[PDB]
């Protein structure tokens, strides 16, 4: 579950922290919020490798572009470079991204699908929990949201995904990008799914395991004398 | 037919108080037929340990490849590669074969020589990174290892305690998988000493 919500003086993106291998939860605290540029962040869904690879590649080329032009990077640049790359690979790079940021032009919120289609909105959601999240956004979104209201709406939309989607779970990550301010990255903004104490300590008595052999491993280089 | 379950095998890594542990089985097979019980899946480049499960030809190829790359690194940098940096190199290397990938499930373990901070990481075959605080699992009995680790593990275990936990996690997971077992190795890793133990286990 990834959402983006436009507010008065900026844009906010949120995401859940679960990555899956089939029906198994591989990472209980994944990081789906990526820094393309200091004030351009995007949330990714789909193939985990593809979303990291595609944001890092465009993030690198955006940095070189920013140095070349002596200008802070623009969201439309990251958006254009991402969609042309994804289109080239005809959806075979399974990257579904919500691209947000503030630049000299203002605040921007975009979504980009794996086939290279982009769209503009005040509120977007992507991933398996998008329908759970979009249900909350369609119920509670209004024009002229404050920063505090937009964070609340964004995190509530992720929670909708966490509870009601089996693909989404664990914590809520948020990133607030306000015009004329540093982007604040709120890692684990909410912790609604903290595991309870176990009934028993499964710490074993020492010597429980049967050992065939023991040896020192040499990690040091070839020595002197 | 499925490349990642022809040869079989498992790797598991855990963090403790000022230490890490990485362990693997020793089986190599052609599906049902067991061929070798000396096929170690854990390699080390300086103080950074890499375990690899999956297609055995790729396990061997990637070991040779990362030895190559870490040797050139050391010659140019004039220092051993660190776990955090090596993790990024594995990821880079796997994703450059995105549309013809190595059928492997790599696991990185080691202690950062400067900060002294214990570090583990896992990868999928196209080089996505899982950087867990607690434990990483890989191979044909990953489901079994997830079950064992999730119940047995507690944080800040002393080296000799952590050994018992990771050993019991591997052994009991391997015994519930047809394509895993035939012996096991456990590496206990501290900042400036590493102990390697072979485990007694059922050979069926």
């Amino acid at each position: 579950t990834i959402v983006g919500v436009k507010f008065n003086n900026g844009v906010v993106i949120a995401a859940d922290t679960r990555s899956t291998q089939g029906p198994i939860v591989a990472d209980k605290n994944c990081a789906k919020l990526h820094r393309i540029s200091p004030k351009i962040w995007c949330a990714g869904a789909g193939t985990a490798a593809d979303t990291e690879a595609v944001t890092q590649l465009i993030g690198s080329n955006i940095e070189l572009h920013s140095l070349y032009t002596s200008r802070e990077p623009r969201v439309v640049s990251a958006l254009q470079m991402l969609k042309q790359h994804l289109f080239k690979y005809q959806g075979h790079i399974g990257a579904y991204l919500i691209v947000a940021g503030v630049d000299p032009t203002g605040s921007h919120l975009f979504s980009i699908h794996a086939h290279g289609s982009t769209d503009v909105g005040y509120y977007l959601s992507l991933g398996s929990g998008s329908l759970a999240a979009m249900a909350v956004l369609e119920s509670h979104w209004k024009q002229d949201l404050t920063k505090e209201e937009a964070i609340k709406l964004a995190s509530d939309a992720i929670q909708a995904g966490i509870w009601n989607d089996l693909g989404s779970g664990s914590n809520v990550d948020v990133c607030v990008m306000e015009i004329g301010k540093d982007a604040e990255y709120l890692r684990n903004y909410l912790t609604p799914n903290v595991r309870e104490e176990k009934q028993k300590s499964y710490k074993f008595p020492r010597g429980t395991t049967a050992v065939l052999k023991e040896s020192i491993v040499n990690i040091c280089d070839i020595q002197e004398e | 037919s499925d490349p990642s379950s022809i040869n079989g095998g498992i790797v598991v890594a855990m963090t403790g108080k000022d230490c890490v542990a990485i362990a693997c089985d020793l089986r190599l097979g052609s599906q049902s037929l067991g061929v070798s019980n000396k096929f170690e899946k854990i390699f080390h480049y300086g103080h950074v340990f890499l375990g690899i499960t999956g297609l055995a030809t790729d396990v061997t190829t990637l070991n040779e490849m990362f030895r190559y790359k870490t040797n050139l690194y050391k010659l140019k940098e004039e220092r051993a590669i660190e776990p955090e940096t090596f993790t990024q190199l594995v990821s880079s290397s796997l994703y450059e074969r995105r549309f013809g990938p190595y059928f492997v499930g790599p696991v990185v373990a080691g202690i950062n020589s400067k900060s002294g901070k214990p570090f583990i990481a896992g990868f999928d075959l196209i080089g996505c990174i899982d950087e867990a605080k607690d434990f990483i699992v890989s191979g044909t009995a990953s489901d079994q290892l997830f079950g064992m680790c999730e119940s047995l593990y507690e944080p800040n275990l002393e080296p000799e305690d952590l050994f018992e936990t990771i050993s019991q996690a591997l052994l009991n997971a391997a015994d519930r998988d047809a394509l895993s077992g035939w012996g096991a190795v456990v590496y206990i890793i501290k900042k400036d000493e590493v102990v390697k133990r072979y485990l007694k286990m059922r050979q069926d």
Partner: peptide, 5 residues
């Protein structure tokens, strides 16, 4: 397998 919100 691959890791896949």
């Amino acid at each position: 397998x691959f890791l896949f919100x």
